[PDB]
Amino acid sequence: SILDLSKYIDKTIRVKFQGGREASGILKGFDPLLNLVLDGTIEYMTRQLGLVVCRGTSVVLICPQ
Amino acid sequence: EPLDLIRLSLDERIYVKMRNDRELRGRLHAYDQHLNMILGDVEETVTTIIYKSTKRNIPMLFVRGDGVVLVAPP
Amino acid sequence: MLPLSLLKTAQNHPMLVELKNGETYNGHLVSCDNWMNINLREVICTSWRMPECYIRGSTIKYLRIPDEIIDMVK
Amino acid sequence: ALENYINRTVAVITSDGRMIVGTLKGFDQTINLILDESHEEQVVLGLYIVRGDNVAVIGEI
Amino acid sequence: SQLLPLELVDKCIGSRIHIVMKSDKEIVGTLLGFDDFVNMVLEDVTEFEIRRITKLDQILLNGNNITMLVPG
Amino acid sequence: MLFYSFFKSLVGKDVVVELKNDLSICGTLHSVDQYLNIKLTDISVTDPEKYPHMLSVKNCFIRGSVVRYVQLPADEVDTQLLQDAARKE
Amino acid sequence: TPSDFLKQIIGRPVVVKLNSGVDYRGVLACLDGYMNIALEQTEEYVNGQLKNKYGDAFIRGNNVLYISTQ
Known part of the structure; x- marks a missing residue:
């Protein structure tokens, strides 16, 4: 993969999703398909979820925080 | 299997729903897994917001499968 | 030359990506793959300055290249 | 194939109905x-x- | 040491889950199972637009439009 | 793979193509591919309002994914062939 | 585990919901790997209003959001 997600883990990231969703969370886990596991997940649509899993296939953009 | 039960109606009048509130009725001539379609003697109705427009194509319209929602009989 | 090759060798250049979203992104290019997924450094995004960004290929509309481009890769 | 269009000028229509004119490289x-x-x-x-x-849509001009 | 996401879905099997589409729809029910494409089997699922329906039995939810999964 | 074959049997025929964005283009089918991309020669305007912003250009590459309908004439197509080949798949 | 499901409920009564919000109640004749469905069922749940009644139907698998039993 072109992005080394290893650095990010235990770091707060900002992910845009296809369909106009923003999510900010703490990167707990990830895969080669770019599915993520986020912690303290807040979804800006304020919406608070917790430990979420984000489908890599709709993962549209990813920055830090 | 759902694609075979479509072979079932070949040469049999069919009713087709497409994205964008359009509806076709015509005689099934051909289809593919993509549910691409050829129909003949087919009338299309477009509902635009309420009015409905029509369009006739007797000879043989082809239809790209990706717009297709439903395929049944009138 | 092919889009992908062009990007592949435009590594280290500056470019401006339009998203399907309507978002403009100004950055220097760091990595590209065959899906056209991008990583950029020194980033500014317009509806925000960031260190690094990742962009899925399927969400790009078009990429403005620096005019240097042809001479820099080739 | 778009091969016959290389290095020629083209009309480009985007899905959103926008229109461009360019050299296709x-x-x-x-x-x-x-x-x-x-x-x-x-x-x-x-x-x-x-x-x-x-x-x-691509068009040769 | 890495936590794989599919492993996170695996353990929430038989639990309550919220499934958040890429649209403004949401489903909460018991997670019965999932595949590699993350198609999803829910049981007795509430359907919401952000209450549309109370489902009784088993729902296959197409992984295609799934955006977020939330245990609990 | 079938509709490719079909379109190949349609070359040098006049057809009317309707794309999703409400654009309508008459012309001569010169080429066909696996994506069902089309190449038309002798571009022309079927309808007054839909027709996009062209003129001098006479040849177009149309992306398959952007076509809704292809308009055909009962004369251009053997129906029975089609039917048994569709059965065949 | 999803395949087992597709084979478990065939011939049971199901609601199939499409991307557009339309819903189709009918009997499950079959279903393939691409989510194509064989239905021939009514298009209205009840309260909103029944929109069509069709005996046999095909639902394009790209459009399906879910397949649910009652």
Whole structure:
């Protein structure tokens, strides 16, 4: 993969999703398909979820925080 | 299997729903897994917001499968 | 030359990506793959300055290249 | 195949109904077009990369 | 040491889950199972637009439009 | 793979193509591919309002994914062939 | 585990919901790997209003959001 997600883990990231969703969370886990596991997940649509899993296939953009 | 039960109606009048509130009725001539379609003697109705427009194509319209929602009989 | 090759060798250049979203992104290019997924450094995004960004290929509309481009890769 | 269009000027219609004029330089199997001297009349850029997704229509002029 | 996401879905099997589409729809029910494409089997699922329906039995939810999964 | 074959049997025929964005283009089918991309020669305007912003250009590459309908004439197509080949798949 | 499901409920009564919000109640004749469905069922749940009644139907698998039993 072109992005080394290893650095990010235990770091707060900002992910845009296809369909106009923003999510900010703490990167707990990830895969080669770019599915993520986020912690303290807040979804800006304020919406608070917790430990979420984000489908890599709709993962549209990813920055830090 | 759902694609075979479509072979079932070949040469049999069919009713087709497409994205964008359009509806076709015509005689099934051909289809593919993509549910691409050829129909003949087919009338299309477009509902635009309420009015409905029509369009006739007797000879043989082809239809790209990706717009297709439903395929049944009138 | 092919889009992908062009990007592949435009590594280290500056470019401006339009998203399907309507978002403009100004950055220097760091990595590209065959899906056209991008990583950029020194980033500014317009509806925000960031260190690094990742962009899925399927969400790009078009990429403005620096005019240097042809001479820099080739 | 878009091969007969290489290095010639083209009309480009995007799916959203927008219209471009450019030199077609590169193109791939996914219809990613590589473009030069583009105009949308105000010039957009000297070099630009465009996604196959956005292409409705190419015309040779 | 890495936590794989599919492993996170695996352990929420038989639990309550919220499934958040890429649209403004949401489903909460018991997670019965999932595949590699993350198609999803829910049981007795509430359907919401952000209450549309109370489902009784088993729902296959197409992984295609799934955006977020939330245990609990 | 079938509709490719079909379109190949349609070359040098006049057809009317309707794309999703409400654009309508008459012309001569010169080429056909696996994506069902079409190439038309001798571009022309079927309808007054839909027709996009062209003129001098006479040849177009149309992306398959952007076509809704292809308009055909009962004369251009053997129906029975089609039917048994569709059965065949 | 999803395949087992597709084979478990065939011939049971199901609601199939499409991307557009339309819903189709009918009997499950079959279903393939691409989510194509064989239905021939009514288009209205009840309260909103029944929009069509069709005996046999095909639902394009790209459009399906879910397949649910009652």
